[PDB]
Amino acid sequence: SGFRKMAFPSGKVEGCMVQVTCGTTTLNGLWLDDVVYCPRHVICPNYEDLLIRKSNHNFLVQAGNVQLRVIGHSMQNCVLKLKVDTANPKTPKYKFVRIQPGQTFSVLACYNGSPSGVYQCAMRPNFTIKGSFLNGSCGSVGFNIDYDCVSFCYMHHMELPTGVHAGTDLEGNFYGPFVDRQTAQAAGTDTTITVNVLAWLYAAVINGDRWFLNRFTTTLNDFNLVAMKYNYEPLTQDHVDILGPLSAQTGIAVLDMCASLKELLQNGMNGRTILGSALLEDEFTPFDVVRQCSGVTF
């Protein structure tokens, strides 16, 4: 029993964190095989003009108490790739994956190439992450683990004026309409990840929290008319299919659980909580719920 916001074990990623310094800027890098990946703003904007003026020895790369020698450099979108002479012996099995809004991942927050904390978070529908970052956290990475393969999905680049964060995938493509430049940027209006709230309601049922259940059902269209009114993302037939296993395990049809969600949105919780929370949690996917309520290991 119990339901916590759980992150993946960070060990395979800790063995890849390095410190990258260029001039007066110090941030974090990801050392995989013989390449160090980091935000291109470390050179700071005409990046392939600021970069032309740089030589290999301008980039100081530190892996623990060891200096790595930079033997090459190239830019891919908003990521700088520093070719180093030494392949990382702790390089895990890995892939670079681009995630969709609503998908969750673990973040290993780092300062000076040293990991300080690990937390779980979700890519918001407005493409920002509600992270916990300070100056020097740039280059910190987001990831998932499947069996023994680390899927790198995020690299931190900046904080927006509302305190939320913006970054890229590991190929340097930003999530959202953001640019790596000090300019007037703002996160768009955010919405609640409906499929994730439903998954968390199934996790509550599995944990013996059933007060919100009711005898009612609803249509997908009727539910989306209500959900669009409460700034909730539309629920697609794909989400309904993804929730199938949890529906079969608990005996509560997905549209049966949607009628619970509609009543919670129109009437509130009335002094009651669900899994120790007075708000509807949207940062657990259906897969996160199945993984935690079955104990999958890595």
Size of the site for ligand R0Q (CB under 6 A): 16
Told to check if 104 binds a second copy by CB under 8 A, we report: no
Token code pair at residue 202:
């199934």
Largest Cα span, the chain: 69
Rounded to a whole number of angstroms, the minimum distance from the CB of residue 133 to ligand R0Q is 4
DSSP string, 194-231: HHHHHHHHHHHHHTT--TT--S----HHHHHHHHHHTT
Told to check if 158 binds ligand R0Q by CB under 6 A, we report: yes
Told to check if 92 binds a second copy by CB under 8 A, we report: no
Told to check if 182 binds ligand R0Q by CB under 6 A, we report: yes
From 51, 60, 75, 99, residue interacting with Cl ion (rule: CB under 5 A): 99
Told to check if 211 binds a second copy by CB under 8 A, we report: no
224, 172, 179: which is closest to 198 by C-alpha? Answer: 224
Q: Which of these ranges, 79-87, 132-140, 230-238, 286-294, lies near ligand R0Q under the rule CB under 6 A?
A: 132-140
From 41, 73, 124, 262, residue interacting with ligand R0Q (rule: CB under 6 A): 41
- Compute CA 173 distance to the chain's CA centroid, rounded to the nearest angstrom: 15
Told to check if 134 binds ligand R0Q by CB under 6 A, we report: yes
Give whichever of 133 and 200 is closer to ligand R0Q, judged by the CB atom: 133
180, 61, 194, 70: which is closest to 122 by C-alpha? Answer: 194
37: left (phi over 0), alpha (psi -120 to 50) or beta: beta
Q: Name residues whose C-beta falls within 8 Å of residue 187's C-beta, 6 or more positions apart in sequence.
A: 124, 126, 127, 128, 160, 162, 164, 166, 176
Token code pair at residue 184:
């007037």
Told to check if 7 binds ligand R0Q by CB under 6 A, we report: no
Told to check if 25 binds a second copy by CB under 8 A, we report: no
Rounded to a whole number of angstroms, the minimum distance from the CB of residue 270 to Cl ion is 35
Q: Which of these ranges, 108-116, 157-165, 262-270, 280-288, lies near ligand R0Q under the rule CB under 6 A?
A: 157-165
Give whichever of 106 and 224 is closer to a second copy, judged by the CB atom: 106
Write down the catalytic residue from 41, 73, 157, 239. Answer: 41
Write down the catalytic residue from 16, 78, 110, 138. Answer: 138
Give whichever of 117 and 245 is closer to a second copy, judged by the CB atom: 117
Mapping DSSP to helix (H, G, I), strand (E, B) and coil, where does residue 41 land? helix
Told to check if 86 binds ligand R0Q by CB under 6 A, we report: no
CA angle 284, 288, 292 (to 5 degrees): 115
Which helix or strand (DSSP H or E) is residue 146 part of? strand 141-146
| 138 counts as catalytic | yes
- Asked if 105 and 58 touch (Cβ cutoff 8 Å), the reply is no
Query: Which residues of the chain form contacts with ligand R0Q (CB under 6 A)?
Result: 1, 25, 41, 44, 133-135, 137-138, 157-159, 165, 180-182
- Active site residue ranges: 41, 138
Query: Which residues of the chain form contacts with Cl ion (CB under 5 A)?
Result: 99-100, 103
